[PDB]
Design a protein around this ligand. Structure first.
Ligand SMILES: [Ca+2]
Ligand SMILES: [Ca+2]
Ligand SMILES: [Ca+2]
Length: 339
């Protein structure tokens, strides 16, 4: 077991309806030599992340989304996607007036590979793995073509006027999405990323609607992730349906953020809910599964990896409100299967 101060609060790693990450660390697999790309709001300079973060890239083209004064650049720092006075919003809706910065991509990155065994803060599912921040979201979200470009690069794809990725990822985490069917361009980048060897792991979404009505779930060649609670049932906001492949803890998830309401001020930790929190659990387990597959000289295709994760899930608590894949992702059964 990890020595980090607040690991006990991370029920989602160890408890009844957790991901049994502890049972894999017991075997010596922590995702060593695995790289996971996080296509999200970018990364904080956080004492509980720094050492597990690789060079990334900022794909945000609009400088009024990026909030760092230019388009695409080599620094994936999360400037903070805060906004005032309906700057992203449907005025006059009071619920759309203002958001503090989410630190979303850092909360996601922490779930995968927070610095673990360094006493401070929290653990990550795959703390021996490293994270490549692919910043594609900022104030208001992000363009789909920035997201698509970002995910292709994340897998080792070359992009015009961007230096080659030295750290191509075996797993690409997309804690994001919106309404509408998968675009041609998105589907194409996903297929190309997959042909490079990457597993694309995506959030089902948070609108209590059929995930098929959204992307990236409606795309081929993704692993779509629903959200469960500490009681092993569907979190009420989680999207659902036949295209949800499996589920993972998506409520009361503790990870790494900043205290700043606008720009980074100091390292913090908070709880979040969302299929966005569930996804990095599956991406971390994916990395665990790969480290174990490496150990017995076994190569796994994205298709093989997705089937290993989908077939080795633990049961839900009851038949569930809605369809939410095969079960809760289960690192113990997944790893045991490949050995
Ligand atoms: Ca920029
Ligand atoms: Ca930047
Ligand atoms: Ca820590």
């Amino acid at each position: 077991a990890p020595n980090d101060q607040h690991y006990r609060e991370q029920w989602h790693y160890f408890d009844r309806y957790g991901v049994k990450a502890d049972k894999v660390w017991d075997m010596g697999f922590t995702g060593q030599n695995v790289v996971v790309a996080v296509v999200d709001t970018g990364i904080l300079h956080h004492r509980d992340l720094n050492a597990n973060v690789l060079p990334g890239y900022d794909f945000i083209s609009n400088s009024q989304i990026s909030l760092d004064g230019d388009g695409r650049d080599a620094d994936p720092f999360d400037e903070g996607d805060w906004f005032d006075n309906w700057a992203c919003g449907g005025y006059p809706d009071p619920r759309k007036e203002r958001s503090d910065s989410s630190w979303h991509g850092s909360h996601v990155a922490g779930t995968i590979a927070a610095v673990t065994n360094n006493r401070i803060g929290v653990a990550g599912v795959a703390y021996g793995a490293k994270v490549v921040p692919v910043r594609a979201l900022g104030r208001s979200g992000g363009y789909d073509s920035d997201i698509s470009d970002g995910l292709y690069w994340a897998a080792g794809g070359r992009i015009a006027g961007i230096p080659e990725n030295r750290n191509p990822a075996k797993v690409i985490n997309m804690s994001l999405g919106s309404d509408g069917q998968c675009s041609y361009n998105a589907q194409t980048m996903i297929d190309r990323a997959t042909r490079l060897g990457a597993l694309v792991v995506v959030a089902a979404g948070n609108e209590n609607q059929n995930a098929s009505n959204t992307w990236p779930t409606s795309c081929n060649n993704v692993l779509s992730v629903g959200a469960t609670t500490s009681r092993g049932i569907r979190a009420s906001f989680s999207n659902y349906g036949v295209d949800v492949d499996l589920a993972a803890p998506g409520q009361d998830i503790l990870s790494t953020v900043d205290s700043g309401t606008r720009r980074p001020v100091s390292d913090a930790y908070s709880f979040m809910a969302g299929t966005s929190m569930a996804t990095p659990h599956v991406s971390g387990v994916a990395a665990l599964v790969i480290s174990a597959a490496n150990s017995v000289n076994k190569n796994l295709t994205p298709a093989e990896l997705k089937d290993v994760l989908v077939s080795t899930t633990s049961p839900f608590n009851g038949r569930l409100d809605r369809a939410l894949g095969s079960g809760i992702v289960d690192a113990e059964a997944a790893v045991n299967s490949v050995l």
